[PDB]
Assembly symmetry: D2
């Protein structure tokens, strides 16, 4: 029995918002790889369709749905639709001067969705909520301001919610990417990329998959005592 | 008085692929659990203790659980003990590329040498031991261009307990982050795990029920729940995580 | 007198009692013209009375920081009759509470920034909430509010720095006020046990920090949250 | 007798590392506020310069030779101050041991520094304990280089200092001794002055205030921390960095 525990997710339903591209897509595939039934979502019908195509292409059971996390109606309706056709999602991954509005809107959406999925986790007496922070999204001071503020909001939010729902054996954690190989870093020249790399002790951009593996671990039974945590996944580049 | 006690299925969990792992403080509790989890994942595990009987218990446990490796005597406060043990491991087993520092300078170690007992002396001596051992294992990780160093914080024990616990945690976070920066370019990750209140032979002493009230999950953590995190940090999937301190405390945060 | 605020106009919200009152008096003591605010006309009148009683020039006003109209109107009133306030002190379901609070900081801060921008000088100082609430809910709400305030203050500081406007915060621990003075003896005794100084802080001890942050000597301090808690750190 | 907000009349203050820059500024600010100031250096010429400056600015006190790495130097200097001046109840630790800098240097520097804080702090606590009043104030090191090594070393030093200051504050609180820290960012020094026009202008871009801090701006904070008005502040690290936060 030493070599035999689940670190797998057979029998679980997972909702991953923002799953059509990059980090979200990678998360969807990693959870599927681990045996979950995955519902990935996008804000558009073509994005939802791409998700279903990808899942099937990689042999993952589940679906692609349209979801707008800013809308109570969209949230309520989508969950009803998942409950009827697939079951309650017990693993939920929120991937979906301006800094204030962005961060405030983001955190209101986490709260809206998190609240909505908690009834079913409460009823199962088990759950995993995992919040994905935003990747370093611009090179100057505005980028650092926005990135740091978003991270701080996410850390405080995640910690509070973890406290609120702990007695129900629901964990609530966050993953805080640094510079990841996605479309903002892809659009810098070789010289600027290598200069950014000089701030990163590992000397390379992170892969989407490297975010997904952490999320996969946080979703497992082995991470059951981890809650209210924000795991930084940034190759050693710390910016706050 | 022997100080070196060594010890057809293919398990899907064996991702640590014959890698050699050194886990200090492995005779008991969290350390023992870490040794077993790394073995479960297919590493060759060298667990250490400060005594020959502890080293023997480690070898006995490893064999009992089907893990290849050994139990050794190691004093992390001593340059000689460190140098010698590593040379011994290199000759007989290979270079350890996964290193887990769980062995902490006790209060009672300093006290026998007649240096002071205060938070300062404890934390300073502890962090000097992490540095000593970490430096020693870095030559072989540098040469392999791969490595994992993972530092285990101390479990929660009045105000003196809170002072010492909080100072130790802050030292560990700053230390781990700095060392991660220093060795990053070599694809060596350096991380920490910060336990909260964990079920060990020390805990079970009304106070229990009060303590649990500070823990959102309403229960003590299991040694195994620490070990799983350490195991993940050691994996290829945690390759972009470095300089991090993962708290494993059921939601109880004490600064 | 490097601590002089002679010639400056200061707006201190929530000034009719406790920490807010103490802040209003400390800034006046340092020579500012102080406009203190409350949510009611009788509160505004108490503020004017107190100021006069302590020899401080300024006024008491009614202000609801949850309302764009109240904010706009009050600033217009102050600008006409007193001048632009260049020192602003914000003293006035965890989710809804913290979110609403931080929306109010933003609303007011934005509003006063036009005049600080035009003067190319400013001080914004945000006061966190005091410890003295029951159980886990009290700790949850307190910790979330503190983290929001730290992140908010740091971001805003970054946004407005180039204009020589500093933005800082003060994070009180267990302070002697009308809200804590009659907490049950068991919670009070527990709180004291967690405090290395072994005493509750005074309102004045918060006010002195705010006063220093408002001075020219604190000009290179920005985006900081100064904890004022006798050594009790709660996260 | 007298009673004022920022007055340090009647207090004796020990400021280590006082012969130049931030330390010198701190010594003068405390003197300005009425303290008797003992400033220290590691050399006789540095001690001389301190006495000369104090007298030039009308501050009572002295300049002493002190090696904070040495128990004997620490013991002896405190004896000397106790005999001739009185017990120092305000103590400001600015004295840190400063192809010259890589990212591996952090350990030895920070370890040596924090051992010296502890040594000195312990030594001055007997007199503060007996007076049932005290101020210990630790000064962090200024951002000391432009690359990753500079950030590594600076961040490590800041973290050590935060943890240290907070723990010591907890240990000595019941005695009405406060223990705080000041964490400078980029301050106007010979390290910022050496660097070319392009590097200077780039550096300032990381600082929201768009300028280097002055030594005096650090000294004003220290002065406030030393006052009776800061009596409920303890275990705090006040960052003084114009909005540039690196950890
Ligand atoms: C928070 O650090 C401490 C608090 C109380 C006692 C000792 C320490 N720190 C300490 O001994 N080291 C070891 C020396 C370099 C260092 C660098 C970053 C963090 C910790 C440390
Ligand atoms: C940690 O902060 C929170 C905890 C619980 C709910 C909301 C928040 N944060 C929050 O409302 N804002 C306001 C929105 C911009 C923001 C930026 C940095 C830190 C906090 C916040």
């Amino acid at each position: 029995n030493l070599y035999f525990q689940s670190m797998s997710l057979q029998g679980k339903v997972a909702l991953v918002t923002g799953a059509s591209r990059g980090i979200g897509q990678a998360i969807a595939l990693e959870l599927g790889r681990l045996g979950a039934v995955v519902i990935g979502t996008a804000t558009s019908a073509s994005g939802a369709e791409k998700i279903a195509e990808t899942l099937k292409a990689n042999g993952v059971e589940g679906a692609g749905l349209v979801l707008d996390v800013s809308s109570d109606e969209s949230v309520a309706a989508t969950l009803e639709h998942i409950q009827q056709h697939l079951g309650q999602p017990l693993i939920v991954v929120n991937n979906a001067d301006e800094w204030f509005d962005v961060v405030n809107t983001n955190l209101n959406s986490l709260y809206r969705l998190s609240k909505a999925v908690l009834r079913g986790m409460t009823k199962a007496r088990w759950g995993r909520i995992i919040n994905i922070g935003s990747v370093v999204g611009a090179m100057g001071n505005a980028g650092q301001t926005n990135y740091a503020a978003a991270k701080a909001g996410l850390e405080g939010f995640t910690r509070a919610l973890a406290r609120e729902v702990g007695s129900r054996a629901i964990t609530v954690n966050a993953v805080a990417p640094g510079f990841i190989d996605t479309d903002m870093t892809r659009e810098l020249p070789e010289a600027q990329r290598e200069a950014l790399l000089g701030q990163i002790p590992l000397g390379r951009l992170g892969q989407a998959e490297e975010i997904a593996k952490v999320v996969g671990f946080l979703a497992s039974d082995g991470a059951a005592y981890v809650t209210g945590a924000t795991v930084p996944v940034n190759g050693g580049m710390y910016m706050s």
